[PDB]
Amino acid sequence: FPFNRTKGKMVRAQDVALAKKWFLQHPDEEYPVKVKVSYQKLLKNYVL
Amino acid sequence: KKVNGTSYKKWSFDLPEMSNLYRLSTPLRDEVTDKNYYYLFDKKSFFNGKALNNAIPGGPKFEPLYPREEEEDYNEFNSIDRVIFRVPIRSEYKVAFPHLYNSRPRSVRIPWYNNPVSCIIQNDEEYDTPALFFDPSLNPI
Amino acid sequence: VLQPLLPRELPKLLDALNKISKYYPGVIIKVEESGEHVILGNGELYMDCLLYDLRASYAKIEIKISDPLTVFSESCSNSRLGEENLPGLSISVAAEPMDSKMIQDLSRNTLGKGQNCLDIDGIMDNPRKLSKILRTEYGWDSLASRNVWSFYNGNVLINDTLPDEISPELLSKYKEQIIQGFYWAVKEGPLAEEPIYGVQYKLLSISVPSDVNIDVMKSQIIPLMKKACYVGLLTAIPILLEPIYEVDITVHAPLLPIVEELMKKRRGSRIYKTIKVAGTPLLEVRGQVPVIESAGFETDLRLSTNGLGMCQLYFWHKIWRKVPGDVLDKDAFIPKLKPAPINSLSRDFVMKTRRRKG
Amino acid sequence: NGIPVKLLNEAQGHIVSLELTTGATYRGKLVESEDSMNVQLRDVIATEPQGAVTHMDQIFVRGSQIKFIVVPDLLKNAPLFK
Amino acid sequence: VSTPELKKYMDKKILLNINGSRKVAGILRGYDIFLNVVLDDAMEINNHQLGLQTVIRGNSIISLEALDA
Amino acid sequence: EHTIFTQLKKNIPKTRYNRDYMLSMANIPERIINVGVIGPLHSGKTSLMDLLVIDSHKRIPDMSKNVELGWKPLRYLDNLKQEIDRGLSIKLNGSTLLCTDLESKSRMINFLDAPGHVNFMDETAVALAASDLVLIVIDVVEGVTFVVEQLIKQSIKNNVAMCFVINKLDRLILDLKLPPMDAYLKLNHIIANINSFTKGNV
Amino acid sequence: SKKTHDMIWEKLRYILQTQELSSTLRESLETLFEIRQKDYKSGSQGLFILDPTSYTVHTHSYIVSDEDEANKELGNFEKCEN
RNA sequence: GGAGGUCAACAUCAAGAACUGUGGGCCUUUGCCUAUAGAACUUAUAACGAACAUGGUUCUUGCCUUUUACCAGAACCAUCCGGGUGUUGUCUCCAUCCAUAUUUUUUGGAACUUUUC
RNA sequence: AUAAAUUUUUAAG
Ligand SMILES: [Mg+2]
Ligand SMILES: [Mg+2]
Ligand SMILES: [Mg+2]
């Protein structure tokens, strides 16, 4: 959605949430348990 | 033409530009175009995740929401003499087809089933690999 | 299976159940002596659509739903005698396997034009000719081809002996009381108290007591056909028939090896055809998996390949398969919390389903 | 293409009346019509130019020899014209 | 352009009402886009048959009213 | 709560073809038909019905501005709750309208959508067993496949009249990106691949 | 090889689609494409222990207008005054 | 008169899948039925914001000397940072459809004479 | 044949 349009309206510069997309997607693989648990916090705060 | 005016609302752009933007922002973008990817990562599999008190393995954990499960009669219906274990029933069943595997849900939602199994095929190597090209992923017909 | 959560609400459930049977045609419903209700439906999603529409619209009451189960059936593969409970009568029944291409035929219901076979539903199509369909196609006894009486869902009854020919008239009396008793013990079952399937019944001979009687025989004879058919099935080396879904799968190509595992795991474990697809990086994969193992299956696929792929199960050809075990063992191994060993699958399901009814 | 032709086609099914060059009116269910008004009709009465009437089954008529066709007034409403 | 749909009337006896207040009868054998009729012969309407088979020109036909249903 | 719907007599859409006249067509059995529509999952069916609808009713309530010009499909005959959020179709569902062939001969038509999952075939078997002719909708990419088989044996087995429509050609180019030629070759490959199941008919 | 390869499969697949061939040639022909989208190490497998930069290699100059020099003189032995 | 404004005021934005005006019939204004015209904005993986906080009451917990301050779930409400559309006002910058004649149409089989009324 | 990870402090008596 951010992109394909080419016609649309502004957003208050703090509404674009740049980093939401990363913690939606899977954790990937490598990361040590610190960052995975960081993900779970970001979900829990989102869903809520 | 490009933008509205000093009050600066309703930007109006053009393909070549919006391309170049696409190009740049490549570090910062979600990049995944197949809805069928998020399978249990949509919302509703989260809400189901909570409300039944499960945890998708990569999932956010929440609170019981219906905390006291401990009340129970000693009751023959679901018992062991009468039940056959063939396949385990992992959770993701219970989050995938909620009303079925899970006796007695409360406040559950509708998982959305599935999408078309995207075929999308992109050619990202060459700038000059032309638009329409028979791509080795395809079968020969 | 179904039970409503609190006993005092049994009525409300019923008042919805009848509704559902109407609104969703496909479903088929049952009770038992148990008070359990039984809900038979097409496929897993279909059970979902129901049970949701059961709880959140028609009946509102929460209920307890079992682990997904399956149907079964009762077949057999080969002095012989039987008795009445008040020794004025007796029956003894012959039972055999039937042609896989016969039973194949019946479950395909057909108009039989051309040089083709015909289905049994039209049995009042030319009866002698009908025996020509039989003699001709099925290698059927021309004398039984004479003697064929009457058919039911998956199987059919026949007659062989002289004291038949003592009273083909006096039996021409009790034909349609027997055809009941046959439907009777067919719909029910010896082991699972579940429908019998694919069996040939050639009667031995029917002793009727001296002077017969008026209303003794009438409804005296049908249950005696119950013990008749059963007794005829037992010594015939029974087995237990399990359905088989005809799997369809679609994948991107390089993800194929993945599928192999699943099937190796799910015991359906036959993928018959890998059909390349044209112009699109897909593989149709046609396969089979039994119903009982198919429980979560479609997810196991849909996940394990990370969003590419899809699956569907379904039942058309109405194929069946023997379940591997030895249909009775006193020495059997029953796991208690693990999937049983295939040296007895069937003994298990007997001693379970019987522990549902009793 | 001709809008009268279209109208005629539409009138298929309906009970049309139909006079020829001869002046022999018919009235019947319009079975089939073509670009050339080659009409077929069912259950059709047939008046002579002088007066007398005759019932008949499935008349065919060639548009060349047709004079004018009366269609039912329901077709006035819709939706051929616009 | 389009063919006259007379396949219903094929191999049936028809009253070909023809030019000048005349008539013809006979079983229908064929036709074309001009509505010429080829028919196995019959009388001219007391009555008298001429020919074994007959061909009627398109222009000449007023009507071809079916004798058989 | 349980479904969507319209409950009133004055908000039902205007329906540009003047209903009562449609009811006039309804007299002759000759001019009306029953078209059932079936295919495999996600083959475009309900969408297609909605092509007919939005092409028929003049001003719809259920359009948001979104699908009006937009992106998400207005899926009109869907109408339940379950069939909405589940994202699917369960109870087969009708729509009637009169519409014109190119002739301008405008026939009354009963369309009936049918579910495309293979655990709902039951509620297609109805849609056949009633309906007069059926459109089997083939999704070009998927190509025909065991489900389209058992369909077409089930259509013609019950003595119905079929027409095929190849669907979702956006997926042809704008995803697969198949040079024009090889695409033509593909369509041919389907057609050849279907005629082997429609035997005495081509 | 990227262009040349590409146009080689231009004509090569162009074969299977437009042409009409034998069975046992065609089956193999498509086994090619299959292992292609399975990436070829079924056909590429070997001894890789040698380096492109380190190992002194010689890129030979031939072109199909070359008669290879057809040397049977180096085929047989001489007298060595050395 | 046109373009704009990091300008203002006043309306309207969560619902029977849902708005409004009008003609006609009935009851007796409401209301029901019928006909007709017009519907910006926002809604179906449901919504004004592909964003994301705080407070109050009430229960269930969790830390556990007591209270502020708190741990994490629910119900019912509130506040706050923002938004769209419409009308009016004001300000700034500029201007005063084939082309052609041999069976279905348009290259005619039309005319003359006579009776009845 | 496993990828399952709670917390965290200031004032007043
Ligand atoms: Mg649909
Ligand atoms: Mg003190
Ligand atoms: Mg104190």
**Which nucleotides of strand H lie within 7 A of protein CB?**
3-6, 16-20, 33-36, 39, 41-46, 49-53, 60, 72-74, 82-84, 103-105
- Distance from residue F2's CA to the centre of ligand 3 (Å): 56
- What fold characterizes domain E1-69? SH3 type barrels. (2.30.30)
Tell me how far apart the alpha carbons of residues B7 and F92 are, in angstroms, rounded to a whole number.
51
Residue pointed to by tokens 């002579």 = D48
Question: Using only C-alpha atoms, what is the Rg of chain A?
Answer: 14
The answer, yes or no, to whether E and D have at least 3 beta-carbon pairs within 8 Å is yes
Cβ(F154)–Cβ(F45) below 8 Å: no
- F48/H22 CA-to-C1' distance in Å: 37
User: Which residue in B73, A32, E22 sits closest to C5, CA to CA?
Assistant: B73
Report how far apart, in Å, the C-alpha atoms of B108 and of each of A40, C239, F55 are: 21, 42, 37
Binding site for GTP: residue ranges of F?
A: 39-46, 113-117, 167-170
| Those residues with Cβ within 8 angstroms of residue F198's Cβ, 6 or more apart along the chain or in another chain | F152, F156, F162
Contact predicate C42/F122, CB 8 Å: yes
Domain count, chain D: 1
Give the gap in angstroms from C-alpha C280 to the nearest C-alpha of chain B: 5
Cβ–Cβ below 8 Å for B136 and G30? no
Token reading at F48 = 């297609």
DSSP state of F15: -
Q: Look up residue B63 and give its amino acid.
A: E
Q: Token pair 């001979």 is at which residue? A: C205
Distance of residue G18 Cα from the nearest chain B Cα, in angstroms: 10
HSE-CB at G67 with a 13 A cutoff on CA atoms is 3
Which amino acid makes up residue C302? R
D12 touches chain E (CB under 8 A): no
Evaluate whether chains A and E are touching (3 or more beta carbon pairs less than 8 Å apart).
no
Strand partners, C273: C286
Tell which residue, C157, C141, C140, has the closest CA to residue C200. Answer: C157
CA distance F142 to F165: 13
Name the β-bridge partners of F32. F108
* Residue B42 contacts C where some CB pair is shorter than 8 Å: no
Looking at residue C196, what DSSP letter applies?
A: B
Fold that domain C1-71 belongs to in CATH: Alpha-Beta Plaits (3.30.70)
- Find which of F119, F185, F191 to mutate to test the C interface (most C CBs within 10 Å of its CB): F119
Distance (Å, whole) CA C273 – CA C63 = 42
CATH of the domain at D9: 2.30.30.100
Which tokens sit at C47? 């059970």
> Residue C321, by phi and psi: left (phi above 0), alpha (psi -120 to 50) or beta?
beta
Tokens of C249: 């799968």
Distance CA E28, CA E56 (A): 11
In angstroms, what is the span from residue B111 Cα to ligand 2's centroid?
60
Provide, in whole angstroms, the distance separating residue A47's CA from nucleotide H68's C1'.
31
Whether the Cβ atoms of residue C277 and residue C283 lie closer than 8 Å to each other: yes
Structural domain count of chain F: 1
Distances in whole angstroms, Cα of residue C155 to Cα of each of B69, C98, C177, C195: 49, 8, 18, 11
Q: Which helix (H) or strand (E) holds C301?
A: helix C297-304
DSSP assignment of E18-49, as one string? ETTTEEE--EEEEE-TT--EEEE--EE---EE
Q: Which technique was the structure solved with, according to the deposited record? A: cryo-EM
- Cβ-based neighbour number of residue F122 at 10 Å: 16
| DSSP class per residue in G16-75 | HHHS---HHHHHHHHHHHHHHHTTSTTTS-S---S-SSSS--------TT------STTT
* H or E element, residue G5: helix G3-18
- Amino acid in position A4: N
Nearest nt to the CA of A10 via C1' is: H83
Q: How far is the CA of C127 from the centre of ligand 2 (A)?
A: 111
| CA F82/CA C58 separation, integer angstroms | 14
Q: Measured between alpha carbons, how far is F106 from F98 in angstroms, rounded to an integer?
A: 6
Rounded to 5°, angle at Cα B80 from B76 and B81: 85
F170 touches C at CB < 8 Å? no
Distance C40 CA to H33 C1' (A): 48
Q: Is any Cβ of chain B less than 8 angstroms from the Cβ of F58? A: no
Beta-carbon pairs below 8 A across chains B and G: 13
Task: Report how far residue B123's alpha carbon sits from residue B118's, in angstroms, rounded to the nearest whole number.
Answer: 16
Dist CA B19 CA C120 (whole Å): 68
The CA distance from G9 to B134, in Å, is: 10
Closest C1' nucleotide to E32's CA: H103
**Alpha-carbon span C297 to B47, nearest angstrom:** 23
- Assess contact for F186 and C279: CB atoms under 8 A: yes
d(C-alpha F174, C-alpha F178), whole Å: 9
G 11-70 residues with CB < 8 A to B? 13, 16-17, 30, 33, 36-37
Whether G33 sits inside 8 A of B134 (CB atoms) is no
CA at C108, C1' at H16: how many angstroms apart? 50
Is C22 within 8 Å of chain F by CB? no
Query: Reported resolution in A?
Result: 4.0
Count of all residues that appear for chain A in the document: 48
Separation of A40 CA and I10 C1' (Å)? 29
Extents of the domains making up chain C: 1-71, 72-78+238-358, 79-237
Q: Note down the domain range covering F26.
A: 1-202
- Structural domain boundaries enclosing D61: 1-82
Nearest by CB to residue E1, choosing from D35, D61, D64, is D35
Any B CB within 8 A of A43 CB: yes
B101, B114, B139 member nearest C280 (Cβ): B139
Alpha carbon C100 to its chain's center: 15
CA F196 – CA F149 distance, rounded (Å): 10
Contact F93/F52 with Cβ under 8 angstroms? no
d(CA F196, CA C355): 50
Does the CB of C87 have a partner CB in chain F at under 8 Å?
no
